[PDB]
Structure 1
């Protein structure tokens, strides 16, 4: 399928144990896609002071359409030193590895894969 329905656990930034996916734009997008597929991907909602607590490159999920079965359509955009790789709508949050942190909520997304 071109799109996959996911429910992403929303994590508080101070709980996150692994604060990024890797060390290059290409690696973080690769790793983020693999974790999204394996159900091992969390979402941190972006506010003042969140991003400086996480590791670059960042992976964002961004609204790609204006929501089948409650799932917002999203795509991946990476960022490193203020340059973004991809073009999409508003940020739903930043993706991180999920290694058993207790979530505060779930974000239903439809991921363009």
Structure 2
């Protein structure tokens, strides 16, 4: 529910997505958020081509930001929500540059 997500530099990320289908990446992202093993990469130019699809975005749903998960594959998004805060990735020990406090609608 209340989470502080480590913000990772894209070139440091070891595991660059959660899986191979929309349903799987949403499931795995939720599991990693629950387990405290989820990182956040901020979306800047050149970032997404360095990550693996389907993407899982964390989006503002409405000092902890209420967020919802939205997946994207082939330019189609699954879920509808607000401003993108970043793309979620597994965290396997990478050193963050910041944290993002979020309230995951769960």
User: 3-state DSSP class of the match of 2:69?
Assistant: strand
Runs of 4+ in 1 over 6 A off after TM superposition: none
Distance 2:61 2:94 in 1: 28
| TM-aligned CA deviation for residue 8 of structure 1 | 0.2
| TM-aligned CA deviation for residue 100 of structure 1 | 0.1
Distance 1:56 1:88 in 2: 19
Unaligned runs of 5+ in 1: none
Q: Deviations over 1:70-97 (max 9, x none)?
A: 0000000000000000000000000000
- Aligned partner (choices 78, 85, 88) of residue 85 of structure 1: 78
Distance 1:29 1:86 in 2: 10
Name the counterpart of 2:51.
Answer: 54
| TM-aligned CA deviation for residue 33 of structure 1 | 0.1
Q: Deviations over 1:17-54 (max 9, x none)?
A: 00000000000000000000000000000000000000
TM-score by length of structure 2 reads 1.00
Name the counterpart of 2:60.
Answer: 63
User: 3-state DSSP class of the match of 1:42?
Assistant: strand
Q: How many residue pairs align between the two structures?
A: 106
